[PDB]
């Protein structure tokens, strides 16, 4: 306490209030998207940013506005200015570019976009906890798709099982 910006993964406009815990993949699979079905064409959302947090896997990323950040008193604020300055610099250098340049930028960015989504999925469970929740779930050491083992981390047993039961059944299956 308190939390720290590690990396800005993305940028969007969405429903005002569609920020925070309710905005994780797990929260969203369980309960639905607070940004439900947001047409740029409900009252303009706000500029919202997808945040990757210090000491927390990508599974736990949240969408946050300049204001929630300031509100939640997080550290790494400097990084919101660079992200913006940098975002502006890109746009300016791409106002007039071939359609080729613009084409390249959209593929070469769909690539990453998709890449980053993989960090949120477990490609292998490698260890579990000797202690268990009251519900009787152990925690799992997870190997995430797309990232080195130095990025493995311990995920809540219930959290995982909701989506990666297969990885779980498979880990125990290899005994």
């Amino acid at each position: 306490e308190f939390e720290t910006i590690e990396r800005f993964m993305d940028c969007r406009i969405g429903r005002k209030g569609a920020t925070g815990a309710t905005t994780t993949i797990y929260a969203v699979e369980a309960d639905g998207d607070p940004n439900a079905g947001f047409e740029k064409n409900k009252e303009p959302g706000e500029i919202q940013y997808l945040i990757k947090w210090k000491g927390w896997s990508h599974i736990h990323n949240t969408w946050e506005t300049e204001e929630t950040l300031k509100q939640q008193n997080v550290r790494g604020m400097k990084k919101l200015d660079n992200y913006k300055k940098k975002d502006q610099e890109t746009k300016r250098w791409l106002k007039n570019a071939s359609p080729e340049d613009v084409e390249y930028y959209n593929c070469q960015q769909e690539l990453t976009d998709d890449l980053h989504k993989q960090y949120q999925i477990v490609g292998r469970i490698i260890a579990h906890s000797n202690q268990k929740s009251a519900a009787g779930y152990p925690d799992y050491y997870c190997k995430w798709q797309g990232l080195p083992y130095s990025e493995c981390s311990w995920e809540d047993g219930a959290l995982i099982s909701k989506k990666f039961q297969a990885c779980i059944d498979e880990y125990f299956s290899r005994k």
Partner: peptide, 6 residues
């Protein structure tokens, strides 16, 4: 342990 499961 530790989720955001508000």
């Amino acid at each position: 342990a530790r989720t955001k499961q508000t």
